Amino acid sequence: SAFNGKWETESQEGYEPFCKLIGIPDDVIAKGRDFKLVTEIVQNGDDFTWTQYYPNNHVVTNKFIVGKESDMETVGGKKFKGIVSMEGGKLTISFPKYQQTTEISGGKLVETSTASGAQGTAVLVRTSKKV
Numbered sequence: 001s002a003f004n005g006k007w008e009t010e011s012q013e014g015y016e017p018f019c020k021l022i023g024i025p026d027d028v029i030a031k032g033r034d035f036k037l038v039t040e041i042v043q044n045g046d047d048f049t050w051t052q053y054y055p056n057n058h059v060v061t062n063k064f065i066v067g068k069e070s071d072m073e074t075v076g077g078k079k080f081k082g083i084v085s086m087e088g089g090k091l092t093i094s095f096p097k098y099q100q101t102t103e104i105s106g107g108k109l110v111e112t113s114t115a116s117g118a119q120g121t122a123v124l125v126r127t128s129k130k131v
């Protein structure tokens with residue numbers, strides 16, 4: 001039940017280098033920095049429903065079972081299959097060019113992603129507070 005509830009972005013460390021690495025144009029990075037994503041999580045043990053509230057009523061819902069291959073969807077609508085493991089309370093997914101670790105730390109939702117681009121890699125640390 002640890003991840004349960006509604007969360008709101010308070011900080012995004014590495015935000016601009018991360019966005020720059022993955023092709024986002026600089027003008028929209030500068031506009032995008034003040035956007036604070038709201039996340040709603042229903043966790044029933046190993047069963048998760050992860051909802052992100054993007055601009056313009058663009059609700060992105062991902063459902064998964066921990067340690068079991070699950071159908072997932074990106075912000076752009078790309079469907080893919082993935083496995084979210086839990087390692088000491090930390091949710092984790094790994095691809096050859098992408099990794100994410102999500103945890104509850106100091107009562108906050110902390111999301112750490114790493115991506116490969118042509119320049120090298122970039123790391124984003126997003127921290128959300130409970131609403």
Ligand SMILES: C[C@H](CCC(=O)O)[C@H]1CC[C@H]2[C@@H]3[C@H](O)C[C@@H]4C[C@H](O)CC[C@]4(C)[C@H]3C[C@H](O)[C@]12C
Binds near residue numbers: 024
């Ligand atoms: C900047 C933009 C806000 C709308 C705008 O300014 O036009 C926001 C809305 C959706 C955001 C993207 C989506 O959240 C998907 C990605 C999530 C990653 O954690 C950061 C990069 C990432 C690719 C985001 C970059 C940027 O913050 C976007 C593109």
Ligand SMILES: C[C@H](CCC(=O)O)[C@H]1CC[C@H]2[C@@H]3[C@H](O)C[C@@H]4C[C@H](O)CC[C@]4(C)[C@H]3C[C@H](O)[C@]12C
Binds near residue numbers: 050073075093100102
């Ligand atoms: C990689 C992508 C951001 C870039 C994009 O939109 O293409 C983001 C948007 C939604 C994210 C997923 C959703 O938050 C649902 C899952 C949440 C877990 O905490 C990690 C895996 C998890 C399956 C995430 C993997 C990945 O970081 C996703 C798919």
Ligand SMILES: C[C@H](CCC(=O)O)[C@H]1CC[C@H]2[C@@H]3[C@H](O)C[C@@H]4C[C@H](O)CC[C@]4(C)[C@H]3C[C@H](O)[C@]12C
Binds near residue numbers: 055058075077
């Ligand atoms: C590509 C997709 C169209 C649906 C599809 O073809 O599957 C479009 C329509 C809705 C768009 C999203 C929404 O308009 C909300 C966001 C608006 C921002 O200007 C860019 C990111 C943003 C998160 C968009 C990403 C992407 O361009 C979406 C997902």
Ligand SMILES: C[C@H](CCC(=O)O)[C@H]1CC[C@H]2[C@@H]3[C@H](O)C[C@@H]4C[C@H](O)CC[C@]4(C)[C@H]3C[C@H](O)[C@]12C
Binds near residue numbers: 074079082
């Ligand atoms: C590898 C995986 C596809 C898995 C599958 O084929 O089932 C893909 C699906 C959507 C991809 C993500 C999206 O294309 C958006 C991002 C694009 C950047 O150029 C790399 C990171 C980035 C965040 C991608 C990481 C990774 O390559 C993802 C998560």
